[PDB]
């Protein structure tokens, strides 16, 4: 049971990663940049 389940999980991660790498191929870059800039504002405010 241990062997089969751990190998199952390893393959789980392998393909999940390989496919999220593909799924990053959308056109949401604007949202990511907006969130990053907001977090930059947060960091700047905190660091002074």
């Amino acid at each position: 049971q241990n062997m089969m389940r751990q190998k199952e999980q390893e393959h789980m991660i392998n393909w999940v990663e390989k496919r999220v790498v593909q799924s990053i191929s959308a056109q949401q870059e604007k949202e990511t940049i907006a969130k990053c800039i907001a977090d930059l504002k947060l960091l700047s405010k905190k660091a002074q």
């Binding site: 999980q9 789980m12 960091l43």
Partner: protein, 495 residues
């Protein structure tokens, strides 16, 4: 499966503003970093590949950072992030029973280390006021070590000998024997063993952990393995990690025991680390620093007085001497740092006399102090008798001379022992009593081993009341002596 998805969430993905530097040149295990303007000395910077390094040199234009892994995972141009803390390690009773590497990263499986406190590997030893004389006994469970060359709590004995003379075996028996104390009622006799494996085959440590788990001895042991393959800056650091995991107990009122195995393979890792920094080699190519390296490490095996918790940290460095040269560089460097020494001859070992302690040269400079009174009574006589036997064994006349020879041979046969077979203190007292008072001078020497075994199986089965009396009252009273004499005489009769 959904367990893994919970494993996803709760991870810290928050981004922070962190200082950074750029690697300039990695090679010989020392990276040069550019930037890191506000980096402390001996800080722990982190490379982009998950590695770690100790900021070693703060030169005006760059930082020499020693990598704690394989320098093939470091480019030129990588990013080095300072973690803003002198080299730390996780400490606590959460590590007990865990095999952590030189940095506290569990190499065990069995989940991660759930530690909540961190120490500095580069701390300082306790001064002169906190320490107090060694008072309590550290029971090794080995007849020769416990009778002739005893050890105390706070002492830092040395185990020195050649290849395959039973140094790791003595260490493992000492670790195993503490099982009985680590089950009793009082937290004052519990010893929390540690075992640092430096430059040792990984299979050896795996089998050692398996053995310690067979003997139920992992409930309190921590194994800090920086094995043969691991980069030199990890074998150099492992002793300090272990010593910190032990200093935690020492400073929180508990008692610890740390076994560095070997320290002759940390000094080799340090010599590599130095010659690759171009430092000027000295005697045998060792840097002149190769003393401070061990002195600072072994000066932490202290024994804090009662105004400082009362804890303690015994240390059992294991040195290995080529061709049994006790006068080499590192063996003498360490013989002048420690409070005792146990020489494991390689010709006594080849005679089947195991463990091969060479009682002529072995010594413990706290010795009689911190020894159970019963063992003191029984074993002072053994020390004198063995001395006399040694004085004369260079030829093999009168009654006294032959008496010395016979008694000495009997005692030698009596002090042999088997692996993973530690003996309670009272059992050693009983055996050495039957040996020294002279209830064995007629039995053939070759049979002295069999007798021993049989005798134990008797005393443990029948007269456990007397042994409990000896254990509780740590002394052989007159009535106890008489009962023990009766037992020995009666048993010997039926033989």
């Amino acid at each position: 499966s959904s367990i893994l998805e919970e494993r996803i969430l709760g991870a810290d993905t928050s981004v922070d503003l962190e200082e950074t530097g750029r690697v300039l040149s990695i090679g010989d295990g020392i990276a040069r970093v550019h930037g890191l303007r506000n980096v402390q000395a001996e800080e722990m910077v982190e490379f982009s590949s998950g590695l770690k390094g100790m900021s070693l040199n703060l030169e005006p234009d760059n930082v020499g950072v020693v990598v704690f892994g394989n320098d093939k995972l470091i480019k030129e141009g990588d990013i080095v992030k300072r973690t803003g803390a002198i080299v730390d390690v996780p400490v606590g009773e959460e590590l007990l029973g865990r095999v952590v590497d030189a940095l506290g990263n569990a190499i065990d499986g069995k989940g991660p280390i759930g530690s909540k406190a961190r120490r500095r590997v580069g701390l300082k030893a306790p001064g002169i006021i906190p320490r107090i004389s060694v008072r309590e006994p550290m029971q090794t469970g080995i007849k020769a070590v416990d009778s002739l060359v005893p050890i105390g709590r706070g002492q830092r004995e040395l185990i020195i000998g050649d290849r395959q003379t039973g140094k790791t075996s003595i260490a493992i028996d000492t670790i195993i024997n503490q099982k009985r104390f680590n089950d009793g009622t009082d937290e004052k006799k519990k010893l929390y063993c540690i075992y640092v494996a430096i430059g040792q085959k990984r299979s050896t440590v795996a089998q050692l952990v398996k053995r310690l788990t067979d003997a139920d001895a992992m409930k309190y042991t921590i194994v800090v393995s920086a094995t043969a393959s691991d980069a030199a800056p990890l074998q150099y650091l492992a002793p300090y990690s272990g010593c910190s995991m032990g200093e935690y107990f020492r400073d929180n009122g508990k008692h610890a025991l740390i076994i560095y195995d070997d320290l002759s393979k940390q000094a080799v890792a340090y010599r590599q680390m130095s010659l690759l920094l171009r430092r000027p080699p000295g005697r045998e190519a060792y840097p002149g620093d190769v003393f401070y390296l061990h002195s600072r490490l072994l000066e932490r095996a202290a024994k804090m007085n009662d105004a400082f918790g009362g804890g303690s940290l015994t240390a059992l460095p294991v040195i290995e001497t080529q061709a049994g040269d006790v006068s080499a560089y590192i063996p003498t460097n360490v013989i002048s740092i420690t409070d005792g020494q146990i020489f494991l001859e390689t010709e006594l070992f080849y005679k089947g006399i195991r463990p091969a302690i060479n009682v002529g040269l072995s010594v413990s400079r706290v010795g009689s102090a911190a020894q159970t009174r019963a063992m003191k009574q029984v074993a002072g006589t053994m020390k004198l008798e063995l001395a006399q036997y040694r004085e004369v064994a260079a030829f093999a006349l009168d009654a006294a001379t032959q008496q010395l020879l016979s008694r000495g041979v009997r005692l030698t046969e009596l002090l042999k022992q088997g692996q993973y077979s530690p003996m309670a203190i009272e059992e050693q007292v009983a055996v050495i009593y039957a040996g020294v008072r002279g209830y064995l001078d007629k039995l053939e020497p070759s049979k002295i081993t069999k007798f021993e075994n049989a005798f134990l199986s008797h005393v443990i089965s029948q007269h456990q009341a007397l042994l409990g009396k000896i254990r509780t009252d740590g002394k052989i009273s007159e009535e106890s002596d008489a009962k023990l004499k009766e037992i020995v005489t009666n048993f010997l009769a039926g033989f």
